[PDB]
UniProtKB/Swiss-Prot annotation, chains A, B:
EC number(s) reported in the record: 7.2.4.5
PANTHER family for this protein: ACETYL, PROPIONYL, PYRUVATE, AND GLUTACONYL CARBOXYLASE-RELATED, METHYLCROTONOYL-COA CARBOXYLASE BETA CHAIN, MITOCHONDRIAL
Keyword Ion transport: yes
GO biological process terms, semicolon-separated: glutamate catabolic process via 2-hydroxyglutarate; L-leucine catabolic process; sodium ion transport
Domain CoA carboxyltransferase C-terminal: 294-557
One Pfam family it belongs to: Carboxyl_trans
The name this protein goes by in its record: Glutaconyl-CoA decarboxylase subunit alpha
Native source organism of the sequence: Acidaminococcus fermentans (strain ATCC 25085 / DSM 20731 / CCUG 9996 / CIP 106432 / VR4)
Amino acid sequence: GFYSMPRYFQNMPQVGKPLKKADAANEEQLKKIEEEIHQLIKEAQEAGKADADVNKRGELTALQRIEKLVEPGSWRPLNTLFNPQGNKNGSVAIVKGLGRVNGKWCVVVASDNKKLAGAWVPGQAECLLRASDTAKTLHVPLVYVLNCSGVKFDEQEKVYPNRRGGGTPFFRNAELNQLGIPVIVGIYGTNPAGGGYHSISPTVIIAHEKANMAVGGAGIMGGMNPKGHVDLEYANEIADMVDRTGKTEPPGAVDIHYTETGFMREVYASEEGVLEGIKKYVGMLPKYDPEFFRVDDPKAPAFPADDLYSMVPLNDKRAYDIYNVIARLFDNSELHEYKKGYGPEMVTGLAKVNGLLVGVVANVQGLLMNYPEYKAAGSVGIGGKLYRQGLVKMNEFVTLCARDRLPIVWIQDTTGIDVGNDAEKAELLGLGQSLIYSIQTSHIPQFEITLRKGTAAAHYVLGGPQGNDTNAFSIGTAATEIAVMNGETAATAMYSRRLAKDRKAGKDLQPTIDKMNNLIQAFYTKSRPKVCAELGLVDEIVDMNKIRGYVEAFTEAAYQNPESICPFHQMILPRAIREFETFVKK
Amino acid sequence: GFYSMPRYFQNMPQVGKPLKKADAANEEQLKKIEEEIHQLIKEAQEAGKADADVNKRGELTALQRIEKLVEPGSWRPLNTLFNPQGNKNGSVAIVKGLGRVNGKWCVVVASDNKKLAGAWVPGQAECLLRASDTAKTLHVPLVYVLNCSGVKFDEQEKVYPNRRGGGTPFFRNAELNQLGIPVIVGIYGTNPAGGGYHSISPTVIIAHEKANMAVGGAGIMGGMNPKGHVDLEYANEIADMVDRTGKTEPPGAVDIHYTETGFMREVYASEEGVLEGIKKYVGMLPKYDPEFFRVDDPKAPAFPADDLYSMVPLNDKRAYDIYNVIARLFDNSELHEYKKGYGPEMVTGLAKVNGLLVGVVANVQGLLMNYPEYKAAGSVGIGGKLYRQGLVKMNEFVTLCARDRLPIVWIQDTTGIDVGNDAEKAELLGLGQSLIYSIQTSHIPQFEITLRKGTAAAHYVLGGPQGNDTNAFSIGTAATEIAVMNGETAATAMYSRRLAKDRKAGKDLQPTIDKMNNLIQAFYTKSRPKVCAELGLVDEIVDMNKIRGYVEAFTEAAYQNPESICPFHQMILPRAIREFETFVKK
């Protein structure tokens, strides 16, 4: 209840406005898209062995385990639709998300036992690497709810080998430990080879009484597996062998890894027990009481989140007030802008999330009168584009946030960076990379929300996911669309030369027109939210009224156990903001 | 010469044996495989616009530029066959390798201007991230010979966005700079957007007089609002603009980024001039005279490299003497083993590469009598497998090399870690991960050679490519085979249950038998050297007599400008080696 510098952090300026005219059409269009995403998630998650078949055997599913593991309502799904290599079931066979486990925000990864008992499938490794990366970026525990059969022989060369294959997570788990970031695992079922390493690499190993973990299974080792080719005779030996064996406890069961090696620290008889074990050890981990880093009491935004269904236009040709979005994602709709008026194409300011201080960077939409300065008077700027002042302001803002150890939330809706030789002379290329440099050297956790458009290099520089060390993860919405550039712009850039040549040659232009339209169509299809999630362009498409939940999870996680601290009374950004407001060059 | 501790580092024991009789069959089969690789390389590199046409107008190709950039004979090709997403031309449109530029080993990346003028294609980003990672791991300069026209629009969603897309290298170039690792670029042709950032992100920028770099293309239709569709009227408008505009210089040309902004430090009229500019600045970069870290004068191996064509059996059933390989890759065939006799399945010892000290770890093949110690007496161990002592020896060895700041060269030919509860109780699962932990916390550059077999978790723990921070890169040979396990074993393990169950239900077993044979066949096909290269399982398949060349480049690169130093007289590994051989615990 007592915080540092109330005059600077409490009762900051408020922004945004009340929703007067509800836009029924926009809302239903956004919800239709959200609904389709939910339907896609639903089927990806339920694909494979049925819950009933899993439960009949007294075993829980990944979603059921997570439900009993995390604090009610703290689950923040991540990569649900991630399927970079297009597996038919639309899944990567793991359920991941951010969730609070016994008081701590954790990155949670649960093997999906409905799918080949948690076998490794194409794209899974990449999903796991993003998981450890998120944990490393935010310095929060990585929790595994393991039930992994390992490599899927069927697509072996796609999941077993390579620099970023199934073995990479084991080095990442060692790195996390070495960085002082605990990895906690609760294991179920059989976990040989890859599963075995997923079992042994964590910091603390909790096991279900019927689980096992091992280097390998030994199999049948009948070396003399015929000449090489499998025949009926040989087949009639494997079957026999199977008969001459029936049940057989796999290597590395509790009698081995608990009683003998002591690798398993604790064993539980029930599925719920295992989860209780995870909670117990996650509870022993370090964290700062959130109050320590608060500058104000937690406060809900001053406007309903649902208003966004009307205020965020799905039609990318319609502009809107970015402040309405900010007003609905941050505490009490408060925002104290840094250098307002300078670099009007962007909003850079200080805001709060459950009392925690963070920096905010978002595109401003609409016309920008008599702008930019490096163009002739009378020129008009376009909201969504980046110019010189906006790039300079952001460079300074990120650098100040970095010094003050403040996390940054980036909200993207951009059509790119200004082009042409006026822009080039105004150093936009140098300034764009300077921002990338500023971000890369910041050492502060960051979150990126591609509200609508994510295009060209602006998508990179605006705290894009391309900054793997600083961006914990990114989300999108029903209004999201990501592409290199506008399809038509690309189409004309790719064929303009041919159009002129063919016309001067008296050649038909229709075929070139068809290709241009097909390309434009392809750009549209491959830029939809659905595809963004599937390829991982965003780690999750989030419902308009679920966005603040992610901002909250990110920020609380960012402040859960920071590696570095800047005392509030020693922060410069708050003072620089005040200073720019009052100082007049006279 | 004058070196530290001659008694420890000079005249170390020698290993290997002379080649009595050459194995003609083995040699021809190995060479046949190498020839196919070379032919695949020739095809991928030549693909696209013919050299004659590129040269018709004074322009040089990537390979021609590299030949004039690097010191003759120092080129070490990397990822020549890398094509993870299977582009039809078998290329990712870049020519990469390690090469000496004005006295310094550098990771060199050149835009392949024969392919869509160096456009970004699926898989390129990953190839570029490996490039910056190698430079980061070895702490050597990254050199770009840029000629990047842009993006292959019809696959833009595969190359433009995402966490590891075309924009990621811009953050990686910022990181390299921040880590004190220079990035130098010589630019040719038009470089808008992505190519623009590849031009501006480096430390030093050199440009050809006709080259340009920009945040993005000016776009023929100026600041005209994009169109959702293309009709004939619009087509003519485009044709009208190209004609109206006629011959127009792209934005960001020399008159802009040299004369005005000064982003281009130097401009050269000829293609060769640009390369001279690169050499000029790379020459200004820091490096240690190799003599500083040498402990002996460079000496070639005591045996001919070509013997490897007879001594390295293509037949994975034939054993061989790993000392013959070691004897032909390291200086004067010298090797001073660490704890020889303990953990006989592995060789861990000190060796020299052009006088530079390095650690060597390699699998021993053949039968290991009265081993392992945790099994009944008289049992026999299998060379190529990993047991308790081998794993403990390697953990200690790696940890000692790390303390002494010595690079490590791993030579793999393994069938995995021993399995079964005896092995489990001997802690092989814990020891395997311990080794991964030892490697991850080492902070020393490492090189991995998959001589033949790279399988199971052993592939991971034996300095596997999966250790992204420490492994600079990996190579293979014509004898290489990489897979989760042997096909037959996988097939039986995957269909053992369906065989016994289908037979009982009185069902045809032929369908399942066919699947097994298809699986076995797939395993073989997908584990061949060329596939290892195409997927990146190895960064390059190297000829038997070209292996030492990479060992040399790696070691010299590693000692070129080290971040940490351990004086020779302060190294413990040399002492630990001696003590183990003389101490008799009375």
